[model samples]
Target: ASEIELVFRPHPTLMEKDDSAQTRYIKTSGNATVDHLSKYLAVRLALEELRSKGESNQMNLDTASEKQYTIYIATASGQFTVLDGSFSLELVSEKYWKVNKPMELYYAPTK
Candidate 1:
């Protein structure tokens, strides 16, 4: 029932690796939907871009966009299972299941 913090770490080669810019802290309720994470990510990136460069074309990304990014279970870092329409509720704070900190995850659009 508490807000869980999800640490989004985009791939170094794919996303901008500027510490705060790359490492985004997003808070959400446990009952949030699975697919909604992608939507949340798009919004987080949009928010992160506010203080960075190339704030033009990227600003238009939304859930309605044609593309969808993939979320992976990472070890603060994936050969991991892909996250889809499942329970983001348990996706709360659990490294290997312990609500100490946020789940360290990475996202990418790659092979």
Candidate 2:
């Protein structure tokens, strides 16, 4: 067991299409830089796993407290902020996964 972990579960709709589609749990290395690296790796793993199905380009995450956040994986171009009424997904950091142009963000609760 590690201090940080990411559990990736594919959308239910993807279950039938891809054989590799299943719940994956990734644990951190317990070091700061290592943990970040491992976290990003898990993120990418989820993105690629979901992408192989060609049905959905988004992955959703729920916090330990069960608060939900959806991650939109950008392929060619990326956006700085995505607004949906009062709930916005703003870029908190980038290049978190090298050239994949990863977006690490906070999901503000909807009003």
Candidate 3:
């Protein structure tokens, strides 16, 4: 599928939460844009997911690897990033879904 492009707007009160959080993750190649819409949405989605968990308003993408990165989905389930030219999610485990590639990100919750 195509990448979804969206903006990430962190909550004002929770902005400082980035300090203890792995808020910024550089590309493994160091060519990834930190402000890219996909990165923003990924981080934003993780933050919102954290809030939904009744947890902190923070997230950490602790490791950046050549093939992928380790994003602490919270103190709970984490996410894996796979490097490819496109975007896709493959079931790696019951709780893990590998992000197949990089692309624009979009998020919308249905009512």
TM-score of each: 0.60, 0.24, 0.21
| Candidate 2 Cα outliers beyond 4 Å, as residue runs | 14-16, 29-111
Steric clash pairs (candidate 2): none
Instruction: Quantify how close model 2 is to the true structure by its C-alpha RMSD in Å.
Output: 14.7
What number of clashing residue pairs does each candidate have, in the order they appear?
Answer: 0, 0, 3
Which structure is stronger by lDDT: 2 or 3? 2
Shift of residue 70 alpha carbon in model 3, Å: 19
Cα RMSD for candidates in order:
4.6, 14.7, 13.4
The global C-alpha lDDT for each of the candidates, from Candidate 1 onward, is: 0.57, 0.35, 0.30
Candidate 2 per-residue lDDT over residues 6-85, each given as its tens digit:
34444333234423344555554424342243234345545675546656434332211212223222234554232222
Candidate 1 residue runs with Cα over 4 Å from true position: 12-21, 47-56, 59-67, 75-78, 91-99, 109-111
Q: lDDT (0-100) at residue 50 of candidate 2?
A: 56
lDDT of 1 by residue, 79-98 (tens): 45466645464653442326
Model 2 lDDT, residue 96, Cα: 29
Q: Write the residue-wise lDDT of candidate 3 on 3-52 in tens digits.
A: 22222233223334322322332223223332232444445455555546
Best model per lDDT: 1
Stretch of 10 with least lDDT, candidate 3? 66-75
For residue 42, model 1's alpha carbon misses the true position, in angstroms, by 1.0
Model 2: weakest 10-residue lDDT segment is 83-92
